[PDB]
Amino acid sequence: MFNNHEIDTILSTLRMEADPSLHPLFEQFEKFYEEKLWFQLSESLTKFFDDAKSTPLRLRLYDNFVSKFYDKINQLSVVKYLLASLKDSKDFDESLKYLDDLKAQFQELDSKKQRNNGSKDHGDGILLIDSEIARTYLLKNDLVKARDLLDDLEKTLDKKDSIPLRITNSFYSTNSQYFKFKNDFNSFYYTSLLYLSTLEPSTSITLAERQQLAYDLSISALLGDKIYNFGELLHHPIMETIVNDSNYDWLFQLLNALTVGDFDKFDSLIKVQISKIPILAQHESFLRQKICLMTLIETVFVKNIRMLSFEDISKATHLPKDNVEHLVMRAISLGLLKGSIDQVNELVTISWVQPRIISGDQITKMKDRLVEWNDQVEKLGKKMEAR
Amino acid sequence: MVLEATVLVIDNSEYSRNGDFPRTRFEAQIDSVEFIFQAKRNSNPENTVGLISGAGANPRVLSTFTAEFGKILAGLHDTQIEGKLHMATALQIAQLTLKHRQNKVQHQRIVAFVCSPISDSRDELIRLAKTLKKNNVAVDIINFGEIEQNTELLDEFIAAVNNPQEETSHLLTVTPGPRLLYENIASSPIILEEGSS
């Protein structure tokens, strides 16, 4: 329609005295393709509030606007679009043609300063094209050539960074797709946590990217044995932003299967469309080993005695004494517990390592314990004054 | 005419890079500060001009009162090029700045160049205008480029501080014609009716 004709002309009137980028023919072209209010391409500040309605296949005219765009606004504004806009269109062929013609510090750097690539708002094409090429071969070709150029991007971020997290979220988006195609869900679990923390403040806070991310958070939480099991799921509003059905209900069954321990819950917790992956076959017994063990630690704890026996663990895990020392020692070697197991006397000594999150039960209890320490020191302190 | 303290408040916000002046208007204010510097320094034997940037960089100060233009012109290139303009907290920075001037007999005056209108409410400017009026602080407002897309939001700030031209409350409106930048504020009653140019 005339939305791009009337609004951009008023904005360009301030952005330039005599508009070089206003062509009566080019303004009529945008109306012929997109007749709706949402346009795939625009200029000035209108393009920030209006994204591609369906697919941006008409961007060929957006590249020609750059020649007359310099006299209006500096080239920092067109880097966030184009190459980064074609990623949403799922076409790497038209984007690759502009990657080699620009590269880094060739055509983009003459009089222009360094905005630290394209992470947010305006920026240059120095470090952004190197990041787009890393994700170009990652989502198309194999992962061999993707990591070779990813290490130069990772070493650049660690050597040089900026104040906002806009660059980190763009960097975590590259690694999020790298560990997704691999068989390691432990590194993919920690990678998705850093991507989710920086996604909420800025850099595409819309729910379009959160639906595809929540699907990966459910797979990384069930399979990943690294950080707790369900503990991190309650911290971030993951299940609150998605529905409870269409294979998203299995996250709720994780808390009920680990606390209760019914064998029928684990068999129905994951069906054959998922559990066919061999990773779960090895981690099937690694999910319930930590929760059943940490539950017995806080139960037996009175004052100085955290000690456990084999019969207490054999009732919770429903396994003989051979599997008790196998599963617990694996969690101890990872650094979760400092204790050990005595096979002769049938005693298990466990120290205090795990911070034991999800508080509020012991806050009222530990408050009176600090009063006991405050009273003993005060009573012994007054006795040292007289004598 | 007499000794006075001039504080220049620029606008680093996103609309300050527009084409009201050729090339980039963000680089246009480089000549605006230089024009005021050469006009005020040649009028009186001892005069200093301050610089305060309150848009997008937080209420910081690029350069305070000084007799040298070297560090003033250099700090304009590397400062924040985009942000949000807030005139409520920016004018309060120049109020405490006037106590740091050279001579206590200098007239208190604040010159602010407003590019784009602020998004904050105009109720804060009512109490802010009464604060500068009790201390006899001259307010110089230059509104250009924001009159086309919006009405002037500082008119209520001038109405409360309203005083005859011999004291305070100097409001200016620059005509959006094909005129040079340093010639817009030259014809305006800023450097006019002084001792020397």
Coordinates of all heavy atoms in Angstrom, one line a residue, chain A residues 276-314:
Chain A
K276 N 14.0 -44.4 21.5 CA 14.8 -45.2 20.5 C 16.3 -44.7 20.5 O 17.1 -45.4 20.0 CB 14.2 -45.1 19.1 CG 14.1 -43.7 18.5 CD 13.4 -43.7 17.2 CE 13.3 -42.3 16.6 NZ 12.6 -42.3 15.3
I277 N 16.5 -43.4 20.9 CA 17.9 -42.9 20.9 C 18.7 -43.7 22.0 O 18.2 -43.9 23.1 CB 17.9 -41.4 21.3 CG1 17.2 -40.7 20.1 CG2 19.3 -40.9 21.5 CD1 17.0 -39.2 20.5
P278 N 19.9 -44.2 21.7 CA 20.6 -45.0 22.7 C 21.1 -44.2 23.9 O 21.5 -44.8 24.9 CB 21.8 -45.5 21.9 CG 22.0 -44.5 20.8 CD 20.6 -44.1 20.4
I279 N 21.1 -42.9 23.8 CA 21.6 -42.0 24.9 C 20.7 -42.3 26.1 O 21.2 -42.3 27.3 CB 21.6 -40.6 24.5 CG1 22.5 -40.4 23.3 CG2 22.1 -39.7 25.7 CD1 23.9 -40.8 23.5
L280 N 19.4 -42.4 26.0 CA 18.5 -42.6 27.1 C 18.7 -44.0 27.7 O 18.5 -44.2 28.9 CB 17.1 -42.4 26.7 CG 16.0 -42.6 27.8 CD1 16.2 -41.6 28.9 CD2 14.6 -42.5 27.2
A281 N 19.1 -45.0 26.9 CA 19.3 -46.4 27.4 C 20.4 -46.4 28.5 O 20.2 -47.1 29.5 CB 19.7 -47.3 26.3
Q282 N 21.4 -45.6 28.3 CA 22.5 -45.6 29.4 C 22.1 -44.6 30.5 O 22.5 -44.9 31.7 CB 23.8 -45.1 28.8 CG 24.4 -46.1 27.8 CD 25.7 -45.5 27.1 OE1 25.9 -44.3 27.1 NE2 26.5 -46.5 26.6
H283 N 21.3 -43.6 30.2 CA 20.9 -42.6 31.2 C 19.6 -43.0 31.9 O 19.1 -42.2 32.7 CB 20.8 -41.2 30.6 CG 22.1 -40.7 30.1 ND1 22.2 -39.6 29.3 CD2 23.4 -41.1 30.3 CE1 23.5 -39.4 29.0 NE2 24.2 -40.3 29.6
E284 N 19.0 -44.1 31.6 CA 17.7 -44.5 32.2 C 17.9 -44.7 33.7 O 17.0 -44.3 34.4 CB 17.2 -45.8 31.5 CG 15.9 -46.3 32.0 CD 15.4 -47.5 31.4 OE1 16.1 -48.1 30.5 OE2 14.2 -48.0 31.7
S285 N 19.0 -45.3 34.1 CA 19.2 -45.5 35.5 C 20.0 -44.3 36.2 O 20.1 -44.3 37.4 CB 20.0 -46.8 35.8 OG 21.2 -46.8 35.2
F286 N 20.5 -43.4 35.3 CA 21.2 -42.3 35.9 C 20.3 -41.1 36.3 O 20.8 -40.2 37.0 CB 22.2 -41.8 34.8 CG 23.3 -42.8 34.5 CD1 24.1 -42.7 33.3 CD2 23.6 -43.8 35.4 CE1 25.1 -43.6 33.0 CE2 24.6 -44.7 35.1 CZ 25.3 -44.6 33.9
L287 N 19.1 -41.1 35.9 CA 18.2 -40.0 36.3 C 17.6 -40.2 37.7 O 17.5 -39.3 38.4 CB 17.0 -40.0 35.3 CG 17.4 -39.6 33.8 CD1 16.2 -39.6 32.9 CD2 18.0 -38.2 33.8
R288 N 17.3 -41.5 38.1 CA 16.7 -41.8 39.4 C 17.8 -42.0 40.4 O 17.4 -42.2 41.6 CB 15.8 -42.9 39.3 CG 16.4 -44.3 38.9 CD 15.4 -45.4 38.8 NE 16.1 -46.6 38.4 CZ 16.6 -47.5 39.3 NH1 16.5 -47.2 40.6 NH2 17.1 -48.6 38.9
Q289 N 19.1 -42.1 40.0 CA 20.1 -42.4 41.0 C 20.4 -41.2 41.9 O 20.7 -41.4 43.1 CB 21.4 -42.9 40.3 CG 22.0 -41.8 39.4 CD 23.3 -42.3 38.8 OE1 23.5 -43.5 38.7 NE2 24.1 -41.4 38.3
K290 N 20.3 -40.0 41.4 CA 20.6 -38.8 42.1 C 19.4 -38.4 43.1 O 19.7 -38.0 44.2 CB 20.9 -37.7 41.2 CG 22.2 -37.9 40.4 CD 22.4 -36.8 39.4 CE 23.7 -37.0 38.6 NZ 23.9 -36.0 37.6
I291 N 18.2 -38.5 42.6 CA 17.1 -38.0 43.4 C 16.8 -39.0 44.5 O 16.6 -38.5 45.7 CB 15.8 -37.9 42.5 CG1 16.1 -36.9 41.4 CG2 14.6 -37.4 43.3 CD1 16.5 -35.5 41.8
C292 N 16.9 -40.3 44.3 CA 16.6 -41.3 45.4 C 17.8 -41.2 46.4 O 17.5 -41.5 47.6 CB 16.5 -42.7 44.8 SG 15.1 -42.9 43.7
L293 N 19.0 -40.9 46.0 CA 20.1 -40.8 46.9 C 20.0 -39.5 47.8 O 20.2 -39.6 49.0 CB 21.4 -40.9 46.2 CG 22.7 -40.7 47.0 CD1 22.8 -41.9 48.0 CD2 23.9 -40.7 46.1
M294 N 19.8 -38.4 47.1 CA 19.7 -37.1 47.9 C 18.5 -37.1 48.8 O 18.5 -36.3 49.8 CB 19.7 -35.9 46.9 CG 21.0 -35.8 46.1 SD 21.0 -34.3 45.1 CE 19.9 -34.8 43.8
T295 N 17.4 -37.8 48.5 CA 16.3 -37.8 49.3 C 16.6 -38.6 50.6 O 16.1 -38.1 51.7 CB 15.1 -38.5 48.6 OG1 14.8 -37.8 47.4 CG2 13.9 -38.6 49.5
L296 N 17.3 -39.7 50.6 CA 17.7 -40.4 51.8 C 18.7 -39.7 52.6 O 18.8 -39.9 53.8 CB 18.2 -41.8 51.4 CG 17.2 -42.7 50.7 CD1 17.9 -44.0 50.3 CD2 16.1 -43.0 51.6
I297 N 19.5 -38.7 52.0 CA 20.5 -38.0 52.8 C 19.9 -37.1 53.8 O 20.2 -37.0 54.9 CB 21.5 -37.3 51.8 CG1 22.3 -38.3 51.0 CG2 22.4 -36.3 52.6 CD1 23.1 -37.6 49.9
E298 N 18.9 -36.3 53.3 CA 18.2 -35.3 54.2 C 17.3 -36.0 55.2 O 17.0 -35.4 56.2 CB 17.4 -34.3 53.3 CG 16.3 -34.9 52.5 CD 15.6 -33.9 51.6 OE1 15.8 -32.7 51.9 OE2 15.0 -34.3 50.6
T299 N 16.9 -37.3 54.9 CA 16.0 -38.0 55.8 C 16.8 -38.6 57.0 O 16.4 -38.5 58.1 CB 15.3 -39.1 55.0 OG1 14.5 -38.5 54.0 CG2 14.4 -39.9 56.0
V300 N 18.0 -39.2 56.7 CA 18.8 -39.8 57.7 C 19.5 -38.7 58.6 O 19.9 -39.0 59.7 CB 19.8 -40.7 57.1 CG1 20.9 -40.0 56.3 CG2 20.4 -41.6 58.2
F301 N 19.7 -37.5 58.0 CA 20.4 -36.4 58.7 C 19.7 -36.0 60.0 O 18.5 -35.6 59.9 CB 20.6 -35.3 57.8 CG 21.4 -34.1 58.4 CD1 22.7 -34.1 58.5 CD2 20.7 -33.0 58.8 CE1 23.4 -33.0 59.1 CE2 21.3 -31.9 59.4 CZ 22.7 -32.0 59.5
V302 N 20.4 -36.1 61.1 CA 19.8 -35.6 62.4 C 20.7 -34.5 62.9 O 20.4 -33.3 62.8 CB 19.7 -36.7 63.4 CG1 19.2 -36.2 64.7 CG2 18.8 -37.8 62.9
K303 N 21.9 -34.8 63.4 CA 22.9 -33.8 63.7 C 24.2 -34.0 63.0 O 24.5 -33.4 62.0 CB 23.1 -33.8 65.2 CG 21.9 -33.5 66.1 CD 21.3 -32.2 65.8 CE 20.1 -31.9 66.6 NZ 19.5 -30.6 66.3
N304 N 25.0 -35.0 63.5 CA 26.3 -35.3 62.9 C 26.3 -36.5 62.0 O 27.4 -36.8 61.4 CB 27.3 -35.5 64.0 CG 27.0 -36.6 64.9 OD1 25.9 -37.1 65.0 ND2 28.0 -37.1 65.7
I305 N 25.2 -37.2 61.8 CA 25.2 -38.5 61.2 C 24.4 -38.4 59.8 O 23.2 -38.2 59.8 CB 24.5 -39.6 62.0 CG1 25.3 -39.9 63.3 CG2 24.3 -40.9 61.2 CD1 24.7 -40.7 64.3
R306 N 25.2 -38.4 58.7 CA 24.7 -38.6 57.4 C 24.8 -40.0 56.9 O 24.4 -40.3 55.7 CB 25.3 -37.6 56.4 CG 25.0 -36.1 56.7 CD 25.6 -35.2 55.6 NE 25.3 -33.8 55.9 CZ 24.1 -33.3 55.5 NH1 23.2 -34.0 54.8 NH2 23.9 -32.0 55.8
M307 N 25.3 -40.9 57.7 CA 25.6 -42.2 57.3 C 24.4 -43.0 56.8 O 23.3 -42.9 57.4 CB 26.3 -43.0 58.4 CG 26.7 -44.5 58.1 SD 27.5 -45.3 59.5 CE 26.2 -45.4 60.6
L308 N 24.6 -43.8 55.7 CA 23.6 -44.6 55.1 C 24.0 -46.1 55.1 O 25.2 -46.3 55.2 CB 23.1 -44.1 53.7 CG 22.4 -42.8 53.6 CD1 22.2 -42.4 52.2 CD2 21.0 -43.0 54.3
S309 N 23.1 -47.0 54.9 CA 23.4 -48.4 54.8 C 22.9 -48.9 53.4 O 22.4 -48.1 52.6 CB 22.7 -49.2 55.9 OG 21.3 -49.1 55.8
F310 N 23.2 -50.2 53.1 CA 22.8 -50.7 51.8 C 21.3 -51.0 51.7 O 20.7 -50.8 50.7 CB 23.6 -52.0 51.5 CG 25.0 -51.8 51.4 CD1 25.9 -52.8 51.5 CD2 25.5 -50.5 51.0 CE1 27.3 -52.7 51.3 CE2 26.9 -50.3 50.9 CZ 27.8 -51.4 51.0
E311 N 20.7 -51.4 52.9 CA 19.2 -51.7 52.8 C 18.4 -50.5 52.6 O 17.3 -50.6 52.0 CB 18.8 -52.4 54.2 CG 19.5 -53.8 54.4 CD 19.1 -54.4 55.7 OE1 18.5 -53.7 56.5 OE2 19.4 -55.6 55.9
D312 N 18.8 -49.3 53.1 CA 18.1 -48.1 52.8 C 18.1 -47.7 51.4 O 17.1 -47.2 50.8 CB 18.6 -47.0 53.7 CG 18.4 -47.2 55.2 OD1 17.5 -48.0 55.5 OD2 19.0 -46.5 56.0
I313 N 19.2 -47.9 50.7 CA 19.3 -47.6 49.3 C 18.6 -48.7 48.4 O 18.0 -48.4 47.4 CB 20.8 -47.3 48.9 CG1 21.3 -46.1 49.6 CG2 20.9 -47.2 47.4 CD1 22.8 -46.0 49.4
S314 N 18.7 -49.9 48.9 CA 18.2 -51.0 48.1 C 16.7 -51.0 48.1 O 16.0 -51.5 47.1 CB 18.7 -52.4 48.7 OG 18.1 -53.5 47.9

